[PDB]
């Protein structure tokens, strides 16, 4: 025959523990995500894996904020960069042989360094001509690799590949996104946005049968976007909250006993 | 004539309560956002509502990782998928009749299933020919609907519509984004990125007046992106924190009284 | 010769304080991001700084959800909006003079107001012709500016510039993103996604030498995306957690003493 507020206190404690456990579980289920920007003065030389079927690389150069007009739009020019060639097997199906021409991408961003590439496909029956390209983080990391074919088979799964069509000048603005996985993977990936500009075919009609591919690679900005996942569920903070609530309840019970022995 | 640290304690309590209320209010005002990825082996067959004005669907097929070259670039071919037709009214303005050709999109993603569509518009006065397309989540959810016109009028507001031009082969990479609203709406939407590739018109000059539209639909990856809003303002955690601070202040006051009766 | 649980209590307190400091440091290092959407019935009129090299603005009009077919595809039409001209210097290199044609952007989104622009470049040696465009928030904020050249030089750094090619009708869907920086900068920026549609050159072959640029500007939706960074590290919450945990440890020690004087 007392106040019996201990029952209400126990109910409050049970409810608070239950809601705290539910909150911790739902916070552990749904991590939040954070984005930051790391400014880099000079990117590492990216690798550009082009896939020309039969078109030959007429020209390739390292340009700057402007490209001078082509002296010969559709004739063999000058290749003026470090390019390699690799042959590997497509991870999707082991019955196809893929030949990749690897180009060292532009490093300088403050100066807006460009990689300008021009291919010509002489004759083909394909209705929609297009050259595929893949981007990987470092060309140097590709050079000193024991298994170049294995490197490219890994890059096929690690990165997504796009394509640029003939009759255009595809201007590819590429940027780096580093996703720091919960396992500390630090997976680096490429994002890119294009702008296709028509090619004014001024060549004589005799040579108009051949198709011309122009593509320009640069970095859109000297910022690498780092994306991380943050776990908002901290067990120790939960323990501290539970301890504080339990202490508050215990002191409330003590004050209730004091009130009972004073007035009630 | 005592220490009168109770006044400082009350000031600290008032400041802590004020800052806690402000922090809770600003956390309730700005929910955080979380992104997760759900891997699906086979997407549900999406619905592609195309809006051909007068162009007739020459061909449509379910292809795989490659498209064989067209046997007849601009002549009636074979339609080899499930297509329906609906007529409804534009939700914005009730004075226009919209006729939509609904195509069952590709399901398989591991096999890189394609939907290839080819239209031909014979003659028109339009300077810039383009066919509009809208994407909705399920074609099956469209088949068994009591009000197909109502379904399309809802799809107009629920989804965004794009267009693909003639003289190109628009390759649409489409992915699904499920935004879980605070009201548990779980609104599903489509994102898409294209790649226009020129069409090498090898048809005779007599038939070059007619315009050809080509479009390819697939899924870019087998990942549905779920975006959720997390409320970082928890009333019960706030109550526990306030209780802990109040208890700390009370025990500090008790120890101050002990110090007064000991030395001070 | 006692229980000496005080040593374990001190170790627990040290570990708890250490992990709390580490958690606070890593939370202060990595702020989370919050995204919100503010609906505006009528955007403030944006400023479109176009950079025509030698092409003259044939036509420019404020249209609505449809554009009627051009009465004269490549002849001087009617300019029917507020346009200004400014001359300034490129912030990157002070040796180039940039002439900008500032155009009054579309305000209404409910009515889907369009800005339709048509330029004609008579003769040039450029292989890939394109007109550059920059978007800034307010044209009115540009009109009453003491230093228009300084305003444009600041807009060059504050905003990113794109380009639209000839032989196309680029439809630019633009939207506003306000990033609220930690310093309360409230930096406003423009995002845009395009859709190039081929231009069917029906003009006589005599006038086909000149290149035509068409572009359409509207707002994709009446939503401004506000992106904020939230600091999850609250010093006062950490103080409350530490105080509650310290009190829990103190009461545990008191109960241990009670147990010692009772049984142990």
mmCIF file of N, CA and C in Angstrom, chain C residues 162-206:
data_model
loop_
_atom_site.group_PDB
_atom_site.id
_atom_site.type_symbol
_atom_site.label_atom_id
_atom_site.label_comp_id
_atom_site.label_asym_id
_atom_site.label_seq_id
_atom_site.Cartn_x
_atom_site.Cartn_y
_atom_site.Cartn_z
ATOM 1 N N UNK C 162 29.575 25.708 -70.739
ATOM 2 C CA UNK C 162 29.423 24.607 -71.679
ATOM 3 C C UNK C 162 29.441 25.168 -73.098
ATOM 4 N N UNK C 163 29.200 24.304 -74.080
ATOM 5 C CA UNK C 163 29.110 24.754 -75.461
ATOM 6 C C UNK C 163 28.057 23.936 -76.189
ATOM 7 N N UNK C 164 27.456 24.545 -77.210
ATOM 8 C CA UNK C 164 26.526 23.855 -78.091
ATOM 9 C C UNK C 164 27.007 23.972 -79.530
ATOM 10 N N UNK C 165 26.890 22.876 -80.273
ATOM 11 C CA UNK C 165 27.474 22.768 -81.599
ATOM 12 C C UNK C 165 26.495 23.217 -82.681
ATOM 13 N N UNK C 166 27.022 23.356 -83.897
ATOM 14 C CA UNK C 166 26.197 23.664 -85.043
ATOM 15 C C UNK C 166 25.567 22.427 -85.642
ATOM 16 N N UNK C 167 24.564 22.656 -86.484
ATOM 17 C CA UNK C 167 23.833 21.545 -87.057
ATOM 18 C C UNK C 167 22.963 20.797 -86.078
ATOM 19 N N UNK C 168 22.765 21.339 -84.880
ATOM 20 C CA UNK C 168 21.975 20.714 -83.834
ATOM 21 C C UNK C 168 20.996 21.731 -83.267
ATOM 22 N N UNK C 169 20.046 21.230 -82.486
ATOM 23 C CA UNK C 169 19.225 22.060 -81.605
ATOM 24 C C UNK C 169 19.429 21.523 -80.193
ATOM 25 N N UNK C 170 20.347 22.145 -79.461
ATOM 26 C CA UNK C 170 20.646 21.728 -78.100
ATOM 27 C C UNK C 170 19.550 22.225 -77.168
ATOM 28 N N UNK C 171 18.878 21.299 -76.495
ATOM 29 C CA UNK C 171 17.844 21.634 -75.524
ATOM 30 C C UNK C 171 18.453 21.521 -74.133
ATOM 31 N N UNK C 172 18.708 22.663 -73.508
ATOM 32 C CA UNK C 172 19.414 22.728 -72.235
ATOM 33 C C UNK C 172 18.380 22.793 -71.120
ATOM 34 N N UNK C 173 18.293 21.724 -70.334
ATOM 35 C CA UNK C 173 17.468 21.699 -69.133
ATOM 36 C C UNK C 173 18.353 22.083 -67.956
ATOM 37 N N UNK C 174 18.103 23.254 -67.375
ATOM 38 C CA UNK C 174 18.953 23.806 -66.331
ATOM 39 C C UNK C 174 18.197 23.883 -65.011
ATOM 40 N N UNK C 175 18.929 23.656 -63.922
ATOM 41 C CA UNK C 175 18.383 23.656 -62.574
ATOM 42 C C UNK C 175 19.395 24.293 -61.632
ATOM 43 N N UNK C 176 18.902 24.741 -60.482
ATOM 44 C CA UNK C 176 19.698 25.511 -59.536
ATOM 45 C C UNK C 176 20.063 24.667 -58.322
ATOM 46 N N UNK C 177 21.337 24.725 -57.937
ATOM 47 C CA UNK C 177 21.846 24.020 -56.769
ATOM 48 C C UNK C 177 22.521 25.037 -55.862
ATOM 49 N N UNK C 178 21.996 25.193 -54.654
ATOM 50 C CA UNK C 178 22.549 26.113 -53.663
ATOM 51 C C UNK C 178 23.274 25.280 -52.609
ATOM 52 N N UNK C 179 24.600 25.376 -52.604
ATOM 53 C CA UNK C 179 25.414 24.713 -51.595
ATOM 54 C C UNK C 179 25.677 25.699 -50.465
ATOM 55 N N UNK C 180 25.160 25.393 -49.278
ATOM 56 C CA UNK C 180 25.382 26.230 -48.105
ATOM 57 C C UNK C 180 26.695 25.809 -47.457
ATOM 58 N N UNK C 181 27.749 26.581 -47.701
ATOM 59 C CA UNK C 181 29.060 26.250 -47.169
ATOM 60 C C UNK C 181 29.087 26.460 -45.657
ATOM 61 N N UNK C 182 30.094 25.860 -45.013
ATOM 62 C CA UNK C 182 30.222 25.972 -43.563
ATOM 63 C C UNK C 182 30.378 27.420 -43.118
ATOM 64 N N UNK C 183 30.940 28.272 -43.974
ATOM 65 C CA UNK C 183 31.088 29.692 -43.684
ATOM 66 C C UNK C 183 29.849 30.500 -44.048
ATOM 67 N N UNK C 184 28.731 29.839 -44.336
ATOM 68 C CA UNK C 184 27.524 30.544 -44.735
ATOM 69 C C UNK C 184 27.655 31.258 -46.062
ATOM 70 N N UNK C 185 28.344 30.640 -47.024
ATOM 71 C CA UNK C 185 28.547 31.272 -48.321
ATOM 72 C C UNK C 185 27.284 31.266 -49.171
ATOM 73 N N UNK C 186 26.478 30.208 -49.077
ATOM 74 C CA UNK C 186 25.269 30.054 -49.887
ATOM 75 C C UNK C 186 25.590 30.191 -51.374
ATOM 76 N N UNK C 187 26.549 29.390 -51.831
ATOM 77 C CA UNK C 187 27.009 29.470 -53.210
ATOM 78 C C UNK C 187 25.974 28.854 -54.145
ATOM 79 N N UNK C 188 25.501 29.641 -55.102
ATOM 80 C CA UNK C 188 24.502 29.201 -56.069
ATOM 81 C C UNK C 188 25.215 28.777 -57.343
ATOM 82 N N UNK C 189 24.801 27.644 -57.906
ATOM 83 C CA UNK C 189 25.419 27.108 -59.107
ATOM 84 C C UNK C 189 24.342 26.521 -60.005
ATOM 85 N N UNK C 190 24.715 26.301 -61.261
ATOM 86 C CA UNK C 190 23.810 25.803 -62.287
ATOM 87 C C UNK C 190 24.222 24.397 -62.692
ATOM 88 N N UNK C 191 23.254 23.489 -62.744
ATOM 89 C CA UNK C 191 23.423 22.202 -63.397
ATOM 90 C C UNK C 191 22.577 22.188 -64.659
ATOM 91 N N UNK C 192 22.998 21.402 -65.643
ATOM 92 C CA UNK C 192 22.278 21.367 -66.906
ATOM 93 C C UNK C 192 22.499 20.027 -67.586
ATOM 94 N N UNK C 193 21.451 19.531 -68.234
ATOM 95 C CA UNK C 193 21.547 18.352 -69.081
ATOM 96 C C UNK C 193 20.903 18.657 -70.425
ATOM 97 N N UNK C 194 21.585 18.263 -71.496
ATOM 98 C CA UNK C 194 21.224 18.637 -72.855
ATOM 99 C C UNK C 194 20.641 17.450 -73.612
ATOM 100 N N UNK C 195 20.164 17.742 -74.821
ATOM 101 C CA UNK C 195 19.681 16.719 -75.745
ATOM 102 C C UNK C 195 19.838 17.292 -77.150
ATOM 103 N N UNK C 196 20.854 16.826 -77.867
ATOM 104 C CA UNK C 196 21.139 17.333 -79.203
ATOM 105 C C UNK C 196 20.255 16.610 -80.212
ATOM 106 N N UNK C 197 19.547 17.383 -81.030
ATOM 107 C CA UNK C 197 18.658 16.859 -82.059
ATOM 108 C C UNK C 197 19.120 17.409 -83.399
ATOM 109 N N UNK C 198 19.243 16.528 -84.389
ATOM 110 C CA UNK C 198 19.804 16.916 -85.676
ATOM 111 C C UNK C 198 18.950 17.981 -86.350
ATOM 112 N N UNK C 199 19.616 18.877 -87.072
ATOM 113 C CA UNK C 199 18.955 19.914 -87.850
ATOM 114 C C UNK C 199 18.866 19.450 -89.297
ATOM 115 N N UNK C 200 17.641 19.350 -89.811
ATOM 116 C CA UNK C 200 17.403 18.873 -91.170
ATOM 117 C C UNK C 200 17.595 20.061 -92.108
ATOM 118 N N UNK C 201 18.769 20.147 -92.728
ATOM 119 C CA UNK C 201 19.095 21.291 -93.568
ATOM 120 C C UNK C 201 18.336 21.232 -94.887
ATOM 121 N N UNK C 202 17.170 21.871 -94.933
ATOM 122 C CA UNK C 202 16.377 21.970 -96.150
ATOM 123 C C UNK C 202 16.682 23.229 -96.947
ATOM 124 N N UNK C 203 17.641 24.036 -96.499
ATOM 125 C CA UNK C 203 18.011 25.243 -97.210
ATOM 126 C C UNK C 203 18.695 24.894 -98.531
ATOM 127 N N UNK C 204 18.651 25.801 -99.509
ATOM 128 C CA UNK C 204 19.315 25.529 -100.790
ATOM 129 C C UNK C 204 20.815 25.335 -100.615
ATOM 130 N N UNK C 205 21.392 24.525 -101.506
ATOM 131 C CA UNK C 205 22.805 24.173 -101.407
ATOM 132 C C UNK C 205 23.720 25.384 -101.506
ATOM 133 N N UNK C 206 23.255 26.481 -102.108
ATOM 134 C CA UNK C 206 24.073 27.685 -102.182
ATOM 135 C C UNK C 206 24.346 28.255 -100.797
#
